[PDB]
């Protein structure tokens, strides 16, 4: 039992785009710091993007000015626009509530796939 859900992956040739969408619960959502995730085999989700329920974001280095975040408090939806995409973003993406602390032990949703090919 989650309360989120991701789409909007697909497959890209590299320098192209997508727009992820995550529809989480309110009570997840509202008020909360939201936050993409990306897995690649192996390895653990590594937070990518984060922003507020006051808009205030935060991005990894590695995708600044590729990718943006942005939230609808109306819809309680989280999206990630994905722009200049390479290989190296090849990812299972998938948002939640950005906690205190680290985030091992949180459910997860069934993310959503993004590959950029090589």
């Known amino acids: 039992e989650v309360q989120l859900q991701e789409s909007g992956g697909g497959l890209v040739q590299a320098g192209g785009s997508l727009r992820l969408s995550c529809a989480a619960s309110?009570?997840?959502?509202?008020?909360?710091?939201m936050g993409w995730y990306r897995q690649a085999p192996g390895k653990q989700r590594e937070v990518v993007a984060v922003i507020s329920a006051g808009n205030s974001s935060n991005y990894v280095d590695s995708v600044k000015g590729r990718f943006t975040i942005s939230r609808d408090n109306a819809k309680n939806t989280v999206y990630l626009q994905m722009n200049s995409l390479k290989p190296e973003d090849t990812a299972v993406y998938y948002c939640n509530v950005v906690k205190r602390g680290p985030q091992w032990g949180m459910e997860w949703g069934k993310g959503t796939l993004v590959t950029v090919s090589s």
């Open positions: 309110g009570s997840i959502f509202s008020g909360n710091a």
